[PDB]
Design a protein around this ligand. Structure first.
Ligand code: MV3
Ligand code: MV3
Ligand code: MG
Ligand code: MG
Ligand code: MG
Ligand code: MG
Ligand code: MG
Ligand code: MG
Lengths: 236, 5, 236, 5
């Protein structure tokens, strides 16, 4: 651990500075260092961890898609053979992406999930586990693709089961989990009807619970509800 | 590409 | 050289792919590898090199400014002492920026500038040398700040002398050099009158040469002329 | 911040 000599509090402070400077690779390294101190994370710290790696892997995914599109075109009929370079560079980006996903999954497995006993923390980490297996599934083409997909499904499902038992239907973690599991169904599991059913049921159950909320909680919940509606509009 | 958080 | 085993042509191809994927750190590493093959660069290759490092250092500069602003505020009257972390992280970003600048200056010194005999290539590289000394000057606070500033000035001045002798006033390299040397005067050399004079004279001399140009050359030249006008509007 | 190329 290159962060092993830095104070936990200093790592958290620098992660926040890195976020302000849009230095997300640095942000992720600082938060990895903080996790490796071994203490459980607060809600704010969990958010810093997730924001950091979301931005890093999000950029990798965008680049992988650009390169995969070029590679696909290169293998159409009538395309000029241009050598191994497009595949090689897509593979380079892919391997870096897989490395980031493995790093995040490693932090969750050693030992964030097993020490997370409150519903809000456990669901949050299990959602992340589903998310990073989902990103691995996006680039998987070989013997383990089915097992990677099932690993995503299993983590999301455990998170869903806890969230339905322990959190209200407007809870933003519960909503965000459902949003992403619905995308998993649509884009990864080839299950668009399940994706639509999940998004619609989540939206309607949340609508019926908004009356219990403060103005600030209402703002949080309806923002994610609009994302559910946005996806439903895309899919129907 | 659909929305995720 | 980690790129030492890759073909020159493959490095150039991958730099172009990296640009399309907005992977500018990769782009810069590929083009550094290409330069280190030892052959002179074509115009297109010079552009790839400059675009790559411009984007890398541009992001570093933006982050350094965010962090330096936070640090300055931290040292105002009535600011709560928050420890060494802001300074430390600004220093980290600063050192990385200085490293990128030293890398680019190293490529120019070993051996791009000395092998560049045509006006268009020599002016382009000398402009880059002025630019990367200028970025070093932006963060310099110590014994060598004056020498760093003079290194920028000297490179820009040599480029200016060649450009005025050998290129027409609408040449985009000549225009871009003048734009950046004018900014050097305003922001680094504390010479706003020189900055304004240079931008205005460059603009007016280019205006009087537009009649000689094709439609495509006119588009290229007037785009940079508008940047000169934009700066003049900022400064007057 | 002024324009450069
Ligand atoms: C510690 C904790 O409980 N964090 C959950 C927060 C809920 C509010 N919130 C959001 O609504 C946005 N991001 C996320 C991220 C993950 C999840 Cl599971 C839900 C929501 C919604 C998108 C825009 C950014 C905030 C932040 C996290
Ligand atoms: C090989 C060569 O001669 N390159 C110079 C090109 C001139 C046209 N051009 C531009 O106008 C823009 N960029 C630059 C970059 C460097 C210099 Cl010295 C001038 C202009 C102008 C800003 C927007 C991007 C193209 C590219 C390079
Ligand atoms: Mg300690
Ligand atoms: Mg692979
Ligand atoms: Mg159901
Ligand atoms: Mg060869
Ligand atoms: Mg320093
Ligand atoms: Mg003069």
């Amino acid at each position: 651990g290159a962060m092993g000599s830095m104070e936990r509090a200093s790592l958290i402070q620098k992660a926040k500075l890195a976020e302000q400077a849009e230095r997300y690779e640095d942000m992720a390294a600082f938060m990895k260092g903080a996790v490796e101190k071994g203490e459980e994370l607060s809600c704010e710290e969990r958010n810093l961890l997730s924001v950091a790696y979301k931005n890093v892997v999000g950029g990798q995914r965008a680049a992988w898609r650009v390169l995969s599109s070029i590679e696909q075109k290169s293998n159409e009929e009538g395309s000029e053979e241009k050598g191994p370079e497009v595949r090689e560079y897509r593979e380079k980006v892919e391997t870096e992406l897989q490395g980031v996903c493995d790093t995040v999954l490693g932090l969750l497995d050693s030992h964030l999930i097993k020490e997370a006993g409150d519903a809000e923390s456990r669901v949050f980490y299990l959602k992340m586990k589903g998310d990073y297996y989902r990103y691995l599934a996006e680039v998987a083409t070989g013997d383990d693709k089915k097992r990677i997909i099932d690993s995503a499904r299993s983590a999301y499902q455990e998170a869903m089961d806890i969230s339905k038992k322990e959190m209200p239907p407007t809870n933003p973690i519960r909503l965000g989990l459902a949003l992403n599991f619905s995308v998993f169904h649509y884009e990864i599991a080839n299950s668009p009807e399940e994706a639509i059913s999940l998004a619609k049921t989540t939206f309607d159950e949340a609508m019926a619970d908004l009356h219990t909320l403060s103005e600030d909680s209402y703002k949080d919940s309806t923002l994610i509800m609009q994302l559910l509606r946005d996806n439903l509009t895309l899919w129907t | 590409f659909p929305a995720t958080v």
